Amino acid sequence: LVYYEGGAVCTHARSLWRLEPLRISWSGSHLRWGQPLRIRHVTTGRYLALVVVDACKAHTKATSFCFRVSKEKLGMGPPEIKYGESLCFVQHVASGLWLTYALKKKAILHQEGHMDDALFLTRCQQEESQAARMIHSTAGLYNQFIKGLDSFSGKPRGPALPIEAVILSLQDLIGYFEPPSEELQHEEKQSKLRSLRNRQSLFQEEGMLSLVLNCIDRLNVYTTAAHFAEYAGEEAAESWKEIVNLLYELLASLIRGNRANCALFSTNLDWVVSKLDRLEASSGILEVLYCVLIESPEVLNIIQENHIKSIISLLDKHGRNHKVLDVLCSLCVCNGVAVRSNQDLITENLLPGRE
Amino acid sequence: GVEIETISPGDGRTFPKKGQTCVVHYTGMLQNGKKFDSSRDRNKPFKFRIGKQEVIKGFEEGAAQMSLGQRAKLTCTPDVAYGATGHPGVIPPNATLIFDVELLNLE
Amino acid sequence: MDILELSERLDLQRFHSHTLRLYRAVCALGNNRVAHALCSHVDQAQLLHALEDAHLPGPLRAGYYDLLISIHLESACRSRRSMLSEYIVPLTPETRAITLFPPGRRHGLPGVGVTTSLRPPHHFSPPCFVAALPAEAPARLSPAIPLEALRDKALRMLGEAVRDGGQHARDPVGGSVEFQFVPVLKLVSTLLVMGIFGDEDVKQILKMIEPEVFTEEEGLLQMKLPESVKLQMCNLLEYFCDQELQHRVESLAAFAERYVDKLQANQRSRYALLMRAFTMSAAETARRTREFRSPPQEQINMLLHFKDDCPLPEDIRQDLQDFHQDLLAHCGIQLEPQSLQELVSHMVVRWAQEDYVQSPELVRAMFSLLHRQYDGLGELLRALPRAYTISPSSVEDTMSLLECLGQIRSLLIVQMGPQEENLMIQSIGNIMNNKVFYQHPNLMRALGMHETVMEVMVNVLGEIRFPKMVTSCCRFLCYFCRISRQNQRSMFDHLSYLLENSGMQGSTPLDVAAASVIDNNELALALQEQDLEKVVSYLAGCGLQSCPMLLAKGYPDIGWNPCGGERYLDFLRFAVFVNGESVEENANVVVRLLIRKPECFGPALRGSGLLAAIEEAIRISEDPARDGPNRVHLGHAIMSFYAALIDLLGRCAPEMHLIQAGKGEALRIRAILRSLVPLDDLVGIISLPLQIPTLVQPKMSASFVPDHKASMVLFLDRVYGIENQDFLLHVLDVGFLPDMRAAASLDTEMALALNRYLCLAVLPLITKCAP
Amino acid sequence: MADQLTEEQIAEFKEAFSLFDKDGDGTITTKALGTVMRSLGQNPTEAELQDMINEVNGTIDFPAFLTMMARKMKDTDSEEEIREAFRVFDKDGNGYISAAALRHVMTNLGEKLTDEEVDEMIREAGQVNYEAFVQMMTA
Amino acid sequence: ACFRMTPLYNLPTHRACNMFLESYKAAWILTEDHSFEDRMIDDLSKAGEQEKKPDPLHQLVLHFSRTALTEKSKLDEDYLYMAYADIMAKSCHLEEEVSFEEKEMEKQRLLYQQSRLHTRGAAEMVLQMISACKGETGAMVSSTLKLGISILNGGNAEVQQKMLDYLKDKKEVGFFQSIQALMQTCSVLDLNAFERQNKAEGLGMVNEDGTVINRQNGEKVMADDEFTQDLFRFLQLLCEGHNNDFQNYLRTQTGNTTTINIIICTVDYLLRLQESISDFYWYYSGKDVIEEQGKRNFSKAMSVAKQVFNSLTEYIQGP
């Protein structure tokens, strides 16, 4: 269903629309009045028909729209359509039905129309629109990868899932989200940060966090790296060790720095700590826990004694790792405010054995 | 469970009586041997009054069982000190303690 | 293994370095029960041994120094640094002999001499581990360490380092010149702020900085220093300029008690000469406007006018100007490098010419130091509001107050748990019976005590976690607001925040806001309009929903709020009625806004009969099944709510003298209130008889009270009026002669609930109509 | 406003209150409130005792005690202030202040009253007495 | 109660010392003047000479620029920056029947001190923090505009050329919106708090040895006056030399995504001023004489009106 919204979903990934006229060649000519075109949603990849619909069932008879100013009974292009000034509506070219409302003012093609279909357009931004289409390119691969895994999720083996397609697709995303260097100039470092703060908020809002959380929890159940990967066979079994480690690097690259996405783990905190001794990518999950426990202080005081007793049990089974002492050093204070409930759970557990 | 094994004998006749202070230059360990405490490192002769239960029960019961200037090794059982919970942060639960004391002066 | 082997091990150096971060983070922010627990694991001698073993590696030296202050010299550090910004001087004769310049125009040494400003002692406790466990414990002090031994060791390690640094050795202590000084300055800086150094010790420290200036080797400032070591130099030098300023204030406090003792005998001799002067009468009162006609605040303002009509002689008016020239020359104004401000202004600027400094912390600590010297006058000025002067007989209770103040500021920085709540209540309960909190309300305001108790109410409200705390805090502010009027003026300023958390038994944050505006025309006239519309929007909710706690208690359901909505009208009846009089500008805007949401009125009149609404209340109050079934009866709160909606509008009725004038706006309102309510509804309410106690006592909080009648009589006597003799005698026999002889019968509990009702509500109204 | 009492009374009050303080808490019984005022020479009967506690459980706390101490000494000084206020007008001190000696003592006091209001003070009131003057000032 | 005032010698001496400090600071220390504001800025400028590195002053305004660019929602009130905002502002106010030559040296010495700041990058520091305000009309944007005037006082030219390029390479929408935000939060003449002040003015001295601090209440009506005058005085000085590009910039930020057209926004404050002064006439149209406080209000509103008509005409003094 089509809707309307305020300003919050105005900036985000959903409210991005691209225009597709019927003629193939010179499609990036100037659009003029009375011109037929299609409407594409960028993230879903669906075609607007007053519902949105798939491209395979998008027909020129079913969905073909146009820009008119007002309904009088009627190479490149000349510069017809200004920005912010045209204030023009849409209607079907076969039906003439004006899309209008009824906070979610449901948009409907209505033959009465209104006095409020005079709507002004705004062009998007280049870095944002590039970030848009790759969501569709990834989620189309990922949900294909999930249900490809779900096929033999119960049936042992006595289509082929996209192994090589997903390995390269994560690695471009890590370098997409890579934090800028400290040796950079200060005025430019700060400028590149606020770009990064958008385009991780622009992912975790429009899905893409729990969707990453899913493909972990379909994969983590196979703790034997080969024997429980033999439900697929020997082909995907050799790459099972890689695909977990790259996955936790993505998630750790998402919630680095950002406070707003760090609160998204306040519900499934116990989902994280339960996988610390998983013996594969043990540094990986421990990396994710460290970046979440320094940005949003509300995740400190929701931690009970059952969690801390696992972390000391992690240190006792993974050597004298100096990263484990970091996360315990973040567990004492937050924003210059200490937690007296946590400052004794460490002490009467860690110290008194002296071992 | 107060076992006193002597290390060096003192006067043999002077004993602490009640309502009185002592000065002990003690040190302690655990049964593993890890030295959780001393007094000479703080360079202070530790003092206390007997009877008023300032120290744990295994300490003052060992204290009047010594002579002046004697050096004794004590062994306080779990039930006589820090029994169930133990000290927070220092002494683990159900820990048997091992001491090395010395009555400096004043009975 | 030997610990010096970590210098090449390079892996267990790191893991034993990060363990020292866990040790400093566990005993962080005054956690002193655990601070004894670390004193077992790292002993006292081996910490003092590690301060000078030069062959220790780099990051392990800065650990064992910073571990030391975080278990011994931090809990005392924050509490004294807090009391540095305020200056509380007593009148001992040791105070009385304090000058700006030392006697001998040669500028004295900074930090050297005698100061008299009050500071609490530190209260260390020695560690032990054989003491028996009790049990809630009161508190644990910071574990102790012998300080007089420590200052000789710390001075020595600094004293070699400024000397060994001149040798330009290729192998510095700890692997750099950075680690040679940063863990020895930030210990010396935090032993200098705790004041435990002797003056002859800081005489040596002044030599070790730049001996060419501070004399009564090469100086430390001339030495080439890396950037972080300059930072601790600023934190060392910032202590010294404050000791110039605190000495300057303590000089000026010494000047005044010498001055006003000289000034009182001058006035009382001049007044006695005025008392015997009969040579004038019209000019005598111009000399008598100052003596007993002006307030004593206006006397000193008038007395001190002789710069460029003063009753003071030329002898004691010149020495003030002689003193005033002694102070500007003491400051940086020449008032036509052998000076400290001459030294700093040279040194800080030259540091900018050395290199382009990148660390933003140092560039802030530089320029804040530099501006402090040039506007040395304004540096004296901004501290002076925190200057207060007490009696020497009050010091024995004042320092007992300040220690009970410090526990609160220590609880500012720790997230509140169920133990320190009992520390806060026992603290606050020990403040409000300490007798000096009352007799100097300027000083309690000067210490920011009224600010401090607000933020601990901020952090708890953010469901209520700790309700027993939040009552005793807002109880303290309500008892604070009536100590002086200007304290109520200060508490008034946080109104919109206090208003945002109006959302139970006991007291409340809203009764703080009520006691911030009571009994004062200044605040009530200055009360905002946007601060008013928030009050009615919370009144906009209560008429539509119930109390969820009451239906959780198993009470009958009532769609509006007879208990919650009455917690706003008792506020607003202090918002328009003051000193037994109504305001105009608030009354003309509360009722214009109260009629934009007519749901805010009680829905029986939004409608059933008003006497019938109370008649609907008597059945549901007398019948226990329709009553709330324990402290809350629904029938007692509905009559109490309508007792609040009535007497509010009675106290917004425009006054009679404005009705004698033809103020059309003022009579427009008097139309509206008379238009809303029928008069004869009141008459059945004013005449309904009550369950008088005799031989048995009825229940006050489930039945009719005389305070229900007391609201109604104020409404008719202020907006409707008693005109003619018949309507006077109409309600006269029906209402009150039933109650009067019911009151004359018992000549007892509700007898005293009705004795004061008659003597405050109706017997005035009879005497309004006695002719 | 609790400032209308001077310091030494609160010093005397706290000395009296701590003397009969129950456990050092600052709580006292309802009976001890009567005894401590009679320890301060004040002798009010149970009528003046009864209305004061219900104005504010049997537990009297020191601020709750002190706010009652303000009101008991606010009303007494509010009436004895105005006869001694008239004392400075008349040269004798009885009440016989001549009206000629008023229009310079009233424009010279510090409420910044001009000649029009001190006129307006007078023609809406020979020498006038004191009791008409405490009537014409309180109004 | 004015008659029962106790004398000073009856008071305890510690309270007598307390009111003295509140008096002695008020009549002597506050009244004292000194000129340290110029003998600081010279040595922060001259010390770059020694035996491409920045100056001591040039380091400072770089640091204040860096704290204005970090992403924060609000602009935290630093007392230190306000302590340096006025000191650099007073470096030009010493120069801010005469001969012809002697006023030119009084003019050109002001262009010397204006050069002593804005070649060290003082022009873009004062342009960044207005974008870092985002409309919060606090105490800092008071103290940042007095520096913005003392650089552009007298109609300097190249500081405008140092300002147009900064708003054209950055495309910084957020400046002009914060400009538009401060414009609407400009108080005008009311007819409600005016009599609130007047009813407050009926009290001259408060009971129990207290004084009604008339500066504490102050002017509840139009206390926004000197600030909102100062913004238009800043706004007048952006097109003083008839710099025609700002005449086409202040109505259209054509490089930017979103125009604001402050010229139209200057009109809309004037209309809100226009009814606000006209209804002040209708209150007094029945009265005969005008008292003292009635004129002080009306002196205020026209003094800001002369500022805004002058700031209007510099948008159109050029043809």
Author numbering:
A (entry chain B): 244 to 292, 299 to 323, 333 to 360, 372 to 427, 434 to 630
B (entry chain F): 1 to 107
C (entry chain B): 1648 to 1751, 1758 to 1788, 1793 to 1873, 1923 to 2014, 2020 to 2047, 2091 to 2216, 2222 to 2262, 2267 to 2369, ...
D (entry chain J): 1 to 56, 61 to 129, 135 to 148
E (entry chain B): 3634 to 3684, 3693 to 3737, 3750 to 3972
Per the authors:
The molecular target of diamide insecticides is the ryanodine receptor (RyR), a large ion channel expressed in the membranes of the sarcoplasmic and endoplasmic reticulum (SR and ER). RyRs govern the release of Ca2+ into the cytosol, driving multiple events, including muscle contraction. Diamide insecticides directly engage and activate insect RyRs, causing uncontrolled Ca2+ release, leading to tonic muscle contraction, paralysis, feeding cessation, and eventually, death of the insect. Therefore, we designed a series of insect-like chimeric RyRs that contain the diamide-binding pocket from Sf RyR and the remaining parts from rabbit RyR1 (rRyR1).
